[PDB]
Structures are given as C-alpha cells and as structure tokens.
Design a protein around this motif. Structure first.
Motif, PDB file in Angstrom:
ATOM      1  N   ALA A  12       0.741  -1.084  -0.064  1.00  0.00           N
ATOM      2  CA  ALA A  12       0.035  -0.106  -0.243  1.00  0.00           C
ATOM      3  C   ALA A  12       0.867   1.418   0.083  1.00  0.00           C
ATOM      4  CB  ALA A  12      -1.031  -0.105   1.155  1.00  0.00           C
ATOM      5  N   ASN A  13       2.007   1.264   0.942  1.00  0.00           N
ATOM      6  CA  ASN A  13       2.910   2.412   0.806  1.00  0.00           C
ATOM      7  C   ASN A  13       3.621   2.387  -0.483  1.00  0.00           C
ATOM      8  OD1 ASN A  13       2.697   1.963   4.062  1.00  0.00           O
ATOM      9  ND2 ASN A  13       2.112   3.965   3.237  1.00  0.00           N
ATOM     10  N   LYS A  14       3.968   1.267  -0.909  1.00  0.00           N
ATOM     11  CA  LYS A  14       4.647   1.197  -2.109  1.00  0.00           C
ATOM     12  C   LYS A  14       3.934   1.557  -3.448  1.00  0.00           C
ATOM     13  CE  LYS A  14       8.344  -1.406  -2.571  1.00  0.00           C
ATOM     14  NZ  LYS A  14       8.234  -1.336  -1.193  1.00  0.00           N
ATOM     15  N   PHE A  15       2.576   1.055  -3.466  1.00  0.00           N
ATOM     16  CA  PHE A  15       1.759   1.493  -4.420  1.00  0.00           C
ATOM     17  C   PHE A  15       1.365   2.966  -4.331  1.00  0.00           C
ATOM     18  CE2 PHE A  15      -2.903   1.871  -5.859  1.00  0.00           C
ATOM     19  CZ  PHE A  15      -2.739   1.621  -7.048  1.00  0.00           C
ATOM     20  N   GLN A  37       3.483   5.143  -3.024  1.00  0.00           N
ATOM     21  CA  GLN A  37       4.619   5.709  -3.444  1.00  0.00           C
ATOM     22  C   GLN A  37       4.935   5.813  -5.193  1.00  0.00           C
ATOM     23  OE1 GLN A  37       6.879   8.049  -3.132  1.00  0.00           O
ATOM     24  NE2 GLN A  37       7.390   7.118  -1.033  1.00  0.00           N
ATOM     25  N   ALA A  38       4.402   4.602  -5.663  1.00  0.00           N
ATOM     26  CA  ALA A  38       4.562   4.662  -6.932  1.00  0.00           C
ATOM     27  C   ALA A  38       3.650   5.693  -7.709  1.00  0.00           C
ATOM     28  CB  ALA A  38       4.038   3.254  -7.602  1.00  0.00           C
ATOM     29  N   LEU A  39       2.374   5.791  -7.271  1.00  0.00           N
ATOM     30  CA  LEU A  39       1.309   6.925  -7.749  1.00  0.00           C
ATOM     31  C   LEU A  39       1.871   8.012  -7.329  1.00  0.00           C
ATOM     32  CD1 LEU A  39      -1.551   6.281  -9.153  1.00  0.00           C
ATOM     33  CD2 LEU A  39      -0.469   4.239  -8.193  1.00  0.00           C
ATOM     34  N   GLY A  40       2.490   8.335  -6.190  1.00  0.00           N
ATOM     35  CA  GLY A  40       3.059   9.580  -6.071  1.00  0.00           C
ATOM     36  C   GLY A  40       4.141  10.111  -6.820  1.00  0.00           C
ATOM     37  N   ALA A  41       5.110   9.073  -7.197  1.00  0.00           N
ATOM     38  CA  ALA A  41       6.092   9.443  -8.376  1.00  0.00           C
ATOM     39  C   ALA A  41       5.388   9.570  -9.678  1.00  0.00           C
ATOM     40  CB  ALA A  41       7.207   8.595  -8.588  1.00  0.00           C
TER      41      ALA A  41
END
Lengths: 49, 49, 49
Positions: A1-4, A6-10
């Motif tokens: 969830a935080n990596k997903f 994080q991906a959507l954040g970049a």
C-alpha cells in the motif's frame, strides 16, 4: 500500500519533460495545433505570385 | 543612400534605425575613410577610440 | 482602417506597449500587423476581422 502509493506519488510528480508519454501528448496537441494554425498560416499570407 | 544610427531610437542598446535618405542615385561603388588628425598641443593630447 | 502603409480591416484598441515607436507598425512573424500605429501618438493595436 505505501509502495503502491509511492508509485502513484512519483506518477503525480513526473510529467515534464523527460517522461514521454507526456511529450507524446504535446506532440499531439502541437501536432494538430501545428497543422491547423500553422499550416493555415502557410496557406494564407503568403502563397501566390 | 540610406543612413542608419542607433543614436535616436536605441541610444543605450545599439539597434540601428534609418535617419536619412540622401538623393544620391548614381550607384556608390567605392568608399574610403577620411583620415582626421587632432591639432592639439603636446599637453592636450588625448587618445581617440 | 486604411493606413498609408497598408490596407486592412481591424478593431483598434488602446493596448500596451510593445513596438519600435519610431517607425510606425508592428508585425507578428508574418505579413500581418498586430497592429498599432498609426495614431498620434497612441497604441491602437489592431486585430483580424
């Protein structure tokens, strides 16, 4: 969830300029805007003798 | 013959603009630089750009 | 309008402030003039029909 997220954040931060798809998008808007307005500027003023 | 100067229109930037058209209709083919010398006395001598 | 320099059909407005200001027109990268000068002395920027 935080990596997903994080991906959507970049995916939020990166549009310009080195991230084509986006340069493909402005290749499209600059494509049809270029063809329309710029080709119509070549068509008129000036062509003829 | 058209004379151009930066003085009247762009004194501080250098772009040249037309300030005269001289009624000279015989084609100019040649020119020379007219030497000027400044008749100063020794103690009044300057350097000229 | 019908300026001495050129014909044309435009909607003059008191705009600001871009030009040369000693010769009278202003073009925008084509044959067209966008467009002030000539009035005495103000910025009547023109447009297309």
């Amino acid at each position: 969830a935080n990596k997903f997220n994080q991906a959507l954040g970049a995916m939020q931060t990166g549009f310009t300029t080195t991230n084509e798809a986006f340069q493909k998008v402005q290749d499209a808007v600059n494509n049809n805007a270029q063809a329309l307005s710029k080709l119509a500027s070549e068509l008129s003023n000036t062509f003829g003798a | 013959v058209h004379l151009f100067s930066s003085r009247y229109v762009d004194l501080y930037g250098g772009n040249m603009f037309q300030f005269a058209t001289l009624p000279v209709y015989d084609t100019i083919k040649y020119y020379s630089i007219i030497p000027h010398s400044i008749r100063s006395i020794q103690s009044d001598r300057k350097a000229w750009a | 309008y019908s300026l001495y320099g050129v014909s044309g059909r435009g909607v003059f407005q008191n705009c600001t402030a871009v030009g040369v200001r000693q010769q009278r027109f202003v073009y925008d990268a084509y044959q067209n003039l966008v467009g002030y000068y000539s009035d005495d002395g103000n910025y009547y920027c023109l447009r297309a029909c």
